[PDB]
């Protein structure tokens, strides 16, 4: 089911997730949510979750590195658009 | 980087994993979670976010999660998992 969540960036400029996909494998997922990060303490997102945009912008046909870039550049807080596992 | 592991089922016929993917527009299947104290976990080969390409020498191409899940359920004893390492 589609949702979205705004995550604060930690002092290390992280929300605390890894990602995979974004390849003949075009969908993009959260693979890990790291303990003690803003994404782990929020509780909204989880492994399995499909990522679909990043501050109102789609990630369609972006590489995993491209989406990592996208996310890191957004400072303070970021809004991850998802479809729940 | 491709691989395959043969995992012994436990007492509940489980290897201890949860899968992702295989919808329309999202064909690829993945391991979403490895659950502690299961065969998959204690073997240590596969992990969250590895791609499942094959079970027991046949492809999972163009199957849904449910179908894959019953492909794995219905092999007793042990099951070989063909994957791509994340
Ligand atoms: C979901 C929850 C939270 C109840 O998990 C657990 O607390 N535990 C505790 C012990 C392990 C796990 C469990 O009960 N399950 C059972 C259901 C499960 C499964 O059937 N089996 C897999 C297997 O490990 O062989 C197969 C089939 C799909 C991929 C491989 C599953 C997952 C996704 C789908 Br689609 C269908 C079944 C996961 C392990
Ligand atoms: C990687 C390991 C296993 C060493 O980490 C850790 O134990 N720690 C503990 C705390 C978190 C995690 C962390 O250090 N990392 C840093 C690197 C990381 C990242 O930069 N994530 C970003 C973020 O969380 O905002 C973006 C980029 C991709 C989507 C989110 C990453 C992930 C995927 C890609 Br591609 C590139 C970088 C993961 C979180």
UniProtKB/Swiss-Prot annotation, chain B:
Compartments it resides in: Cytoplasm, Perinuclear region; Membrane; Postsynaptic density; Synapse, Synaptosome
Effect of residue 9 to E: Abolishes interaction with GRIA2, but not with PRKCA
Residues given in the record as Zn(2+) binding sites: 26, 28
Annotated PDZ domain residues: 4-86
Post-translational events: Phosphorylation at Thr-64 appears to inhibit the interaction with AMPA receptors.
Expression by tissue: Ubiquitous.
Residue list for modification Phosphothreonine: 64
Entry superkingdom: Eukaryota
Function: Probable adapter protein that bind to and organize the subcellular localization of a variety of membrane proteins containing some PDZ recognition sequence. Involved in the clustering of various receptors, possibly by acting at the receptor internalization level. Plays a role in synaptic plasticity by regulating the trafficking and internalization of AMPA receptors. May be regulated upon PRKCA activation. May regulate ASIC1/ASIC3 channel.
Subunit structure, interactors included: Monomer and homodimer. Interacts with CXADR. Interacts presynaptically with the glutamate receptors GRIA2, GRIA3, GRIK3, isoform 3 of GRIA4, isoform A of GRM4, GRM7 and GRM8; with NAPA and NAPB; and with BTG2. The interaction with NAPA and NAPB disrupts the interaction with GRIA2, conducting to the internalization of GRIA2.
Entry's free-text remark on domains: The AH domain mediates binding to F-actin. The unoccupied PDZ domain is probably involved in allosteric modulation by forming an intramolecular bridge with the AH domain leading to a 'closed' formation. Binding of a PDZ ligand, such as GRIA2, allows enhanced interactions with F-actin and the Arp2/3 complex thus enhanced inhibition of actin polymerization.
Protein name, entry field: PRKCA-binding protein
Organism: Homo sapiens
Residues of the full protein shown: 19 to 104 of 415
């Amino acid at each position: 089911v589609p949702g979205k969540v705004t995550l604060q960036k930690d002092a290390q400029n992280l929300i605390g997730i890894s990602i995979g996909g974004g390849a003949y494998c075009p969908c993009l997922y959260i693979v890990q949510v790291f303990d003690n990060t803003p994404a782990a303490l929020d509780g909204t997102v989880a492994a399995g979750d499909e990522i679909t945009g990043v501050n109102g912008r789609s990630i369609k046909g972006k590489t995993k590195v491209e989406v990592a870039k996208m996310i890191q550049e957004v400072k303070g807080e970021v809004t991850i658009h998802y479809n729940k596992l």
